[PDB]
Design a protein around this ligand. Structure first.
Ligand SMILES: Nc1nc2c(ncn2[C@@H]2O[C@H](COP(=O)(O)OP(=O)(O)O)[C@@H](O)[C@H]2O)c(=O)[nH]1
Ligand SMILES: [Mg+2]
Lengths: 170, 14
């Protein structure tokens, strides 16, 4: 059969939320995508042999509420917490995103994956160890990606799907 | 600020 999964991609402006989502749904890198566009995108993939329908909200303008986020923050099953490896402030923001999602969900167990994007760049400011340790403090996976080269993109989304599957078994 | 959903708000710009 199949399973549908509602995913929400969050993180600072410019970390590559749109580039990651577009690499997942269209299999190419789009280097210029309006930073104000917040929308949901549907994509059918196969994960571990099962047909999987992904309904992904690519968030934007997160300093204000939106009706799309009011709907997906409540119904969303899993979240990708994205930072850029060359942006310290985007990594420093991560704990704020997790804390707020936990309050929205009223739960200490919300499926999440930490994503360190832009792994192709030469001037990283966030060491992989700091991100691995932060993910370990939350009990969640950490995946290094590059939306530019497609490195780790399917792994980030599929790992989040695996985290949701485990949560649903409870 | 960060306002992902009502009625939460976090000041993350400081
Ligand atoms: N080098 C590189 N640039 C990226 C990557 N992901 C996104 N970008 C660039 O970073 C900028 C912000 O990307 P975008 O997807 O719009 O970010 P968003 O604001 O989180 O949706 C754009 O100029 C993208 O081309 C990546 O993995 N590597
Ligand atoms: Mg975007």
């Amino acid at each position: 059969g199949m399973t549908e999964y509602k995913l929400v991609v969050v993180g600072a402006d410019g970390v590559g939320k749109s580039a990651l989502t577009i690499q997942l749904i269209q299999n190419h890198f789009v280097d210029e995508y309006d930073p104000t566009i917040e929308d949901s995108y549907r994509k059918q993939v196969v994960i571990d042999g099962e047909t999987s329908l992904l309904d992904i909200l690519d968030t934007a303008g997160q300093e204000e509420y939106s009706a799309m986020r009011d709907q997906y923050m409540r119904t969303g099953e899993g979240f990708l917490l994205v930072f850029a490896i060359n942006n310290t402030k985007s990594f420093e923001d991560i704990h704020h995103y997790r804390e707020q999602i936990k309050r929205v969900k009223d739960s200490e167990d919300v499926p999440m994956v930490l994503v360190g994007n832009k792994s192709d760049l030469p001037s990283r400011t966030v060491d992989t160890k700091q991100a691995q340790d932060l993910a370990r403090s939350y009990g969640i996976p950490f995946i290094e990606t590059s939306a530019k080269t497609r490195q780790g993109v399917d792994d980030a989304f599929y790992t989040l799907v695996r985290e949701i599957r485990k949560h649903k078994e409870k | 600020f960060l306002r992902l959903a009502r009625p939460f708000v976090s000041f993350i710009c400081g």
